[model samples]
Target: GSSGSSGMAAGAAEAAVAAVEEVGSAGQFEELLRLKAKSLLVVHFWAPWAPQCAQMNEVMAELAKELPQVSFVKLEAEGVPEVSEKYEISSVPTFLFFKNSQKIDRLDGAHAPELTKKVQRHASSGPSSG
Candidate 1:
């Protein structure tokens, strides 16, 4: 029997969770909002036919890895029209930042730099008084 340091690396993975996810319905989106109420949540309202949305998802993945504390979600704008209407998401690749289930900031384009800036802003906006 050979026990190697690889086992230790495997254990470290259990501490991290998949930060990016898809919400197929309004119910799923709402459930996620409440579940991640305390933490920063970034919701990407995307469309299937939009190429920019696809690119944003890749950016979202990188942001997710860098900011594991933030919850990144992909919601199909047209797939779940009810939720989109409620949020006034009239375009593809619109991102909304939420905390405590409240809308904190919004981005209306597929700009990767803008997305990264917002994620960093909120991810670091924690109770850090010392």
Candidate 2:
């Protein structure tokens, strides 16, 4: 049960397409901030028009399976302009890592291997509690 629901969601604002838990609003960002205090938080800034974002979505799904302990969030870059602007995300397929509600690292673009490596590293090392 937990396995499939760990990092996916449905609907227009859903985080993922599969059985992952949905965090569908800006308020969910705060929930992710709280989660970051105890675990690695990976948020994907994506757009429906970008092919790279589509590819990255698949990668994110796979990564979700590979790294179940990390909380993965899939956000529509265009739908949440404020959130994207707040983070200065001007492009699709942007990957942001957070710890304790603060950004720790980021990668702009659909680089799957690099994304996986970063997620694994941060997920294993653990996030800062402060």
Candidate 3:
């Protein structure tokens, strides 16, 4: 008589978290803002046609990872015309920092360092890097 039974291995992978949330419509954006009313939210208004927007998106992702407490959002400026118009987004890459459902700061260009600085400024986590 010969019998062999040996199989015991169960492992789960790490859960994945999205750094950036993409808003599709004006209503959705507002609901998101409402949900995160008390926290720091960074809304990025961008267009697919712009290369700078692409670069800034990468920057946003990195920022999100570094600052987990902050909510990072990406909205297609042209795709969601209503939100863009409401926010007065006139350019391809614009950053709006919000809190309590209100705009706190606005950056109208692809300035990665400045954006990071702004996020850090509003994040209110700790002392400045400098």
Q: Could you tell me the TM-score of candidate 3?
A: 0.80
User: Clashes in model 3: which pairs?
Assistant: none
Sort every candidate by TM-score, greatest first: 1, 3, 2
lDDT assessment of candidate 2: 0.74
TM-score of 2: 0.75
Among these predictions, the greatest TM-score belongs to: 1
Index of the highest-lDDT prediction: 1
Lowest-lDDT window of 10 residues in candidate 1? Answer: 6-15
Compose the digit string of candidate 1's lDDT tens values, residues 1-130: 8867764453333366656898889998888888889878889988889999988888888889977777899898888988999877889789999888899899998898988988888888655611
- The superposed Cα distance between candidate 1 and the true structure at residue 9, in angstroms, equals 29
- TM for every model, in the order presented, reads 0.82, 0.75, 0.80
lDDT per residue, candidate 3, 1-130, as tens digits? Answer: 9966577667777443548998889888899888777668889987879999988999888878877677898988888989888766879689888787888788888898988889988887433433
